[PDB]
Design a protein around this ligand. Structure first.
Ligand SMILES: Nc1nc2c(c(=O)[nH]1)N[C@H]1C(S)=C(S)[C@@H](COP(=O)(O)OP(=O)(O)OC[C@H]3O[C@@H](n4cnc5c(=O)[nH]c(N)nc54)[C@H](O)[C@@H]3O)O[C@H]1N2
Ligand SMILES: Nc1nc2c(c(=O)[nH]1)N[C@H]1C(S)=C(S)[C@@H](COP(=O)(O)OP(=O)(O)OC[C@H]3O[C@@H](n4cnc5c(=O)[nH]c(N)nc54)[C@H](O)[C@@H]3O)O[C@H]1N2
Ligand code: SF4
Ligand code: SF4
Ligand code: SF4
Ligand code: SF4
Ligand SMILES: [S]
Ligand SMILES: [W+6]
Lengths: 214, 964
């Protein structure tokens, strides 16, 4: 299977990844307003599969700790969303055997959408208020099957986004955690045995987002 | 197969936004016969490796955009609507306005009887957004028509760099390139927000960190850059020279300079004349009447033969290095800490980390962009950086340099093509009214009697002659010299620049303005003044992607179309991915891009618009005669066109240049029609043409070197990322300028592990050597008259050493360093109703006035409205909560914005008072989107500089109040 290693110690919050996701899928823009933050859209939605969350933490002396979290589906090894959807109708949520992608199909319109979102420990699924279809990150599974990187990985200028075979990516994550700890001693990997999107947090993951980890 | 890309043709392009020059891949429907279907990064491009920031990543939405102009629009005097018109009508009527205005205004001789052959009734703004071939053709069209008021973006963010670095090193260019940042041991980012404003640069900055580099951000604000640096050091607005002066003192006191480099390669050993002095904030030769220096008082002591005297022992008290130590002794840690607001602990940390790069096998780089270098002493800010880099041996080396980051994709190119009032292409000066002949023009170039000084500019007659042969190939250069307009020798150069063009416009002194690929109704300081001033034009031509605040100024806020008599032509141009040609990035990489989709609707590439417009003017003169027709009738435009269209390829070949006859030059025999292989083979006798001598070597008999996509590197090239077979950089593919400074006098690199050049088997290996000759036989700075990196820089108006003069006026009354408060060679009101320092800056997601990015739904989605960033302290003072609407006001205007309350802004302590900074983005305007807000330039003064001609957009006084 495939894996993302997301080294958040390298993120400049450029939001290339946020735009790249929408360009590749030709997703519409939300109506947004500035409510006193750079963060926008404020949340994942039916039409936003990735948003960069911004958090400012006070620190001693000049500046802040500015935490950036490009949020997406974790493509869980044993996805609760599928376990919940499969109650109502199998085939609404499937797992690709080759990549390990967890994939919502058109049959999500027939299942209890609200219930599938509740099953997700990362609060990822979003419902279309018209068609009741569920959407989220699909790992750019078609690009991946065709030997391309996911749009958000290829676009990333900093090396925050990394993608490959689970074995090379777990080894990269372990090696990078050791190097990053030299700058950020409280660095941790997010749920690295349970998911296919492994984040390196520079500190308590919950500082980045309340559902950063399960 | 991916269905989306199946059946589409793949072409390569270069991003149309910032000067990083990221590679794109464009997919165009119907095997190239339809619209773009996808735009993303070029995975093979050596700078971005497929990465794009949100601006590059949204180019699909920019190009395939239903809000884009579809055809020319016409607005009649006093009309309140556009009328759609044909290209034939628009360009015929524009040509008639050009000819009518020129015929009525053209002056052969000025008041003093001097030949000037110009019109002062038409001005042009733009543009760094056009391709290099377009910028070159555009300048030549405007000058053939007799214009002198020719300006663009470069005046604001580029112009201060050129003389600071030219004084120091001999060229104004960024010294290294983007990939080279990965070779640095310490990266100082100061007056730059590179993670937001040059985002792919951080690929290479973070690679330097991976190899053990320290990353330092010095900025009044904590930004997305600051988040990813090892050290964030806050600095008070305008306290940069104190900061850098303190670093110079720290280097000298602690003996951290690269002794052998300083002795051999800088002017450290040169003996300054006894007439040089500095006392109480003034250098010798000060004229208090005319607020000007007699710079002859700063001259070097010359030897019997006219060569500046040298003491290689560095003992003589008038050695540059000893005068330098004496000048900076005042910049002690306590004083510098007090004025910068930087703690002594942080200054020591930053100075220790950066000055450690004075070790021969360590390299430090300085990255700066626009920052606050606008003010009258910005040149001296950049001078201080150059001097630090020369003391540390960081110039000419991998991971070193002054990385003066260019703004726009082709601001390097547009400046190189002379779209500024003072320069022709290739940085040959525009003649003044006293340069009565080509011989007198050429007489001005200083000579050197030092046989080790290359003094390359002595070749200028070859470049000026070859330029005149490119324009007027049937004419002797001495005769063609009289065709082009001249500025008055009697006037301040700044009378011809950006800010005075707006002033003259407000006095009704212009009939016509070209707003060509710019949005001056949003980009000019004091927008209320400039918007009103545009109503005093008879005609306005706006060439642009979309209807905008400039095209439609006449129906802007508080404007009555019925009272505004300006005739406006809106000509819609095509996006970058719809045309072919080159753009020159910040590292001087001249990169070729290709047409993907055909032009949207009836949009046209700039080259076709300007050429058709000029051809119509030409036709009119052929039928009607008129004012001095020769410069127009005789211009060589046949070399610009193929198959009835503007030909980027043919213009690029002309810019490189070709032999007009069989010619023997520098040992070799050349044949009529052969491309010039390099500027080394240009002649002053009319045997050669070249539109731009810097381009000689770019498009040779070997073909278009700008179009090379070859990643082939030797080990030594690959170790530092030169990519010499990827595109082409001026000059003659020298990727790192001044690289002779990177080796000792035997040609051994100071740092073999990061060699730039090396002497091996009677040859320079690695980069192209910046100046031919055996090791130890030439001074390394070949464009300098004397051959040396200038620590002491006596061509500078403000003095040969940088000195703190307060660029803040309103909150400062004392100078800790002298009794001279403000720049003594430089009318702020400081009305107490506006107690806060307003500043404008950028965000990653928007571009310039936002004309382009406010049309891109994914960028508006992320940054939908003008905001106002303030400290918790100011928020408490004014009772502003995060997300409240606030009114920001100045003497010049007022606007509303959403408050962002953040610890990323902190108060400045200035002369024992807390002074608050108010931050605004300048990316918004009234046209689009819904509730986006208007330009921050409603607030800014059109008070700029008799030195620079540049407005104050980084520190201007405002109030902020909560709205209910
Ligand atoms: N995303 C994006 N990128 C851009 C552009 C854009 O519009 N959007 N525009 C492009 C263009 S045309 C240009 S010219 C460049 C300009 O690039 P930058 O110079 O990076 O642009 P700014 O954000 O205006 O200013 C940089 C920083 O200068 C800081 N600063 C302000 N006053 C001072 C001072 O006195 N001293 C110091 N040391 N720092 C100070 C500001 O706080 C800011 O963080 O960016 C280019 N890149
Ligand atoms: N307050 C404040 N004011 C500033 C600044 C600041 O920091 N603060 N920065 C200053 C600087 S450094 C700059 S560079 C200026 C920028 O000021 P402008 O150049 O006026 O800004 P825009 O018009 O937004 O720049 C992008 C333009 O490029 C045009 N364009 C894109 N592609 C093409 C093409 O192929 N052909 C043509 N003809 N046009 C094309 C778009 O139509 C658009 O008008 O603003 C300056 N003004
Ligand atoms: S593209 Fe990379 S650096 Fe930019 S916000 Fe996304 S993850 Fe962070
Ligand atoms: S993997 Fe694909 S679908 Fe998922 S966030 Fe990235 S670009 Fe969007
Ligand atoms: S993160 Fe949530 S939506 Fe995504 S696979 Fe896991 S349970 Fe399903
Ligand atoms: S705006 Fe600059 S950094 Fe962003 S993709 Fe374009 S060239 Fe690269
Ligand atoms: S620029
Ligand atoms: W600029």
């Amino acid at each position: 299977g495939k894996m993302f290693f997301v080294d958040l110690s390298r993120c400049t919050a450029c939001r290339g990844c946020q735009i790249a996701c929408k360009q590749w899928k030709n997703l519409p823009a939300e109506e947004t307003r500035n409510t006193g933050s750079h963060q926008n859209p404020p949340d994942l939605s039916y039409v936003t599969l990735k948003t960069v969350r911004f958090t400012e933490k006070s620190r001693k002396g000049p500046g802040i700790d500015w935490l950036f979290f490009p949020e997406q589906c974790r493509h869980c090894v044993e996805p609760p969303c599928k376990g919940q959807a499969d109650v109502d109708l199998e085939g609404a949520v499937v797992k690709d055997e080759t990549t390990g992608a967890v994939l919502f199909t058109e049959l999500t319109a027939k299942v209890d959408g609200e219930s599938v979102r509740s099953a997700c420990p990362y609060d990822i699924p979003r419902i279309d208020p018209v068609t009741k279809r569920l959407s989220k990150c699909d790992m750019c599974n078609d690009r991946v099957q065709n030997g391309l990187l996911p749009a958000c990985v290829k676009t990333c200028p900093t090396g925050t986004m990394n993608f490959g075979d689970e074995q090379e990516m777990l080894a990269l994550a372990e090696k990078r955690l050791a190097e990053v700890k030299k700058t950020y001693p409280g660095a941790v990997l997010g749920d690295p045995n349970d998911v296919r999107v492994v984040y390196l947090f520079t500190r308590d993951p919950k500082d980045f987002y309340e559902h950063a980890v399960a | 197969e991916l269905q989306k890309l199946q059946w589409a043709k793949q072409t390569t392009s270069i991003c149309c936004y910032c000067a990083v020059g990221c590679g794109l891949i464009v997919h165009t429907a119907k095997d190239g016969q339809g619209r773009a279907v996808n735009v993303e990064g070029d995975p093979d491009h050596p700078i971005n490796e497929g990465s794009l920031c949100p601006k590059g990543a949204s180019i699909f939405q920019l190009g395939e955009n239903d809000q884009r102009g579809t055809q020319p629009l016409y607005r009649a005097p006093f009309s309140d609507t556009w009328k759609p018109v044909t290209w034939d009508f628009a360009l015929t009527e524009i040509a008639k306005r050009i000819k009518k205005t020129r015929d009525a205004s053209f002056t052969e001789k000025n008041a003093a009887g001097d030949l000037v052959n110009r019109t002062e009734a038409i001005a042009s703004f733009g543009s760094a957004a056009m391709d290099n071939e377009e910028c070159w053709a555009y300048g030549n069209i405007l000058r053939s028509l007799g214009l002198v008021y020719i300006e663009h973006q470069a005046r604001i963010x580029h112009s201060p760099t050129v003389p600071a670095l030219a004084e120091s090193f001999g060229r104004g260019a960024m010294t290294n390139h983007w990939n080279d940042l990965a070779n640095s041991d310490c990266i100082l980012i100061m007056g730059s927000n590179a993670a937001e404003n040059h985002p792919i640069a951080f690929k290479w900055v973070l690679r330097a960190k991976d190899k053990g580099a320290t990353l330092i951000h010095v900025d009044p604000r904590f930004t997305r850059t600051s988040a990813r640096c090892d050290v964030y050091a806050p600095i008070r607005s305008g306290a940069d020279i104190p900061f850098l002066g303190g670093l110079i003192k720290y280097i000298l006191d602690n003996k951290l300079y690269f002794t052998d480099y300083v002795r051999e390669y800088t002017n450290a050993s040169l003996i300054v004349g006894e007439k040089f002095s500095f006392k109480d904030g003034l250098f010798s030769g000060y004229d208090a009447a005319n607020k000007k220096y007699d710079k002859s008082m700063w001259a070097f002591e010359l030897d019997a033969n006219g060569v500046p005297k040298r003491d290689p022992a560095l003992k003589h008290p008038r050695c540059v290095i000893n005068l330098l130590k004496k000048h900076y002794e005042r910049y002690n840690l306590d004083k510098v800490a007090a004025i910068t607001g930087t703690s002594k602990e942080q200054l020591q940390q930053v100075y220790k980390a950066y000055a450690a790069t004075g070790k021969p096998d360590k390299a430090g780089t300085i990255m700066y962009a626009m920052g606050w270098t606008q003010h009258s002493v910005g040149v001296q800010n950049i001078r201080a950086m150059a001097m630090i880099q020369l003391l540390l041996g960081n110039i000419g080396v991998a991971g070193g340099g002054v990385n003066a980051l260019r703004g726009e994709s082709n601001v390097q190119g547009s400046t190189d093509q002379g779209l500024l009032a003072h320069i022709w292409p290739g940085y040959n000066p525009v003649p003044n009214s006293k340069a009565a002949t080509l011989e007198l023009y050429n007489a001005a170039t200083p000579q050197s009697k030092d046989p080790m000084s290359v003094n390359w500019w002595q070749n200028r007659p070859k470049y000026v002659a070859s330029y005149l042969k490119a324009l007027y190939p049937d004419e002797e250069p001495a005769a063609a010299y009289d065709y082009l307009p001249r500025i008055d020798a009697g006037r301040k150069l700044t009378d011809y620049f950006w800010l005075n063009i707006f002033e003259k416009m407000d006095k009704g002194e212009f009939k016509g303005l070209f707003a060509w690929g710019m949005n001056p109704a949003c980009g000019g300081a004091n927008a209320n003044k400039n918007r009103k001033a545009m109503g005093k034009l008879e005609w306005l031509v706006n060439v642009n992607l979309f209807e905008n605040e400039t095209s439609s100024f006449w129906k802007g806020p508080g404007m009555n179309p019925a009272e505004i008599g300006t005739e406006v032509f809106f000509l819609p141009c095509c996006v970058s991915i719809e045309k072919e040609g080159s753009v020159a990035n910040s590292g001087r990489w001249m990169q070729w891009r290709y047409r993907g989709p055909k032009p949207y609707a009836e949009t046209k590439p700039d080259g076709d618009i300007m050429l058709d417009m000029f051809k119509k003017v030409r036709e009119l003169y052929a039928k009607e005669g008129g004012a001095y027709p020769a410069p127009i009738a005789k211009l060589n435009i046949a070399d610009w066109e193929e198959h009835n269209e503007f030909s980027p390829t043919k213009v690029a070949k002309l810019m490189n240049g070709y032999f007009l006859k069989d010619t023997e030059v520098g040992g070799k025999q050349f044949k009529k029609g052969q491309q010039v292989p390099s500027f080394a083979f240009l002649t002053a006798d009319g045997s050669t043409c070249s539109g731009n001598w810097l381009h000689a070597g770019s498009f040779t008999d070997a073909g278009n070197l700008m179009a090379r996509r070859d990643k082939t590197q030797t080990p030594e090239q690959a170790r530092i990322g030169l990519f010499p077979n990827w595109s082409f950089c001026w000059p003659v593919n020298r990727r790192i300028l001044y690289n002779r400074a990177s080796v000792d006098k035997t040609g051994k690199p100071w740092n073999p592990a990061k060699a730039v050049i090396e002497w091996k088997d009677g040859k320079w290996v690695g980069d192209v050597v910046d100046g031919g000759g055996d090791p130890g036989t030439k001074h390394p700075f070949i464009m300098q008259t004397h051959g040396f990196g200038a620590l002491y820089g006596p061509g500078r108006e403000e003095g040969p050493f940088p000195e703190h003069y307060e660029p803040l006026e309103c909150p400062v009354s004392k100078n800790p360093f002298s009794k001279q408060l403000h720049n003594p060679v430089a009318k702020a009101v400081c009305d107490p109703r506006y107690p806060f320092i307003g500043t404008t800056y950028r965000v990653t997601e928007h571009w310039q006035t936002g004309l382009m990015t406010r049309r891109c739904a994914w960028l508006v989605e992320a940054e939908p409205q003008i905001f106002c960033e303030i400290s918790k302290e100011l928020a408490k003072l004014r009772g502003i909560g995060n997300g409240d609407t606030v009114k920001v006001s100045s003497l010049r205007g007022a606007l509303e914005a959403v408050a962002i309350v953040t610890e990323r802004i902190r108060p400045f302590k200035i002369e024992g008072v807390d002074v608050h900074m108010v931050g605004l983005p300048w990316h918004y305007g009234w046209m689009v989107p819904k509730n986006g807000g208007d330009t921050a330039n409603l607030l800014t003064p059109s008070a700029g500089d008799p030195n620079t001609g540049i407005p104050e957009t980084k520190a201007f006084m405002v109030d902020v109040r909560k709205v209910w």
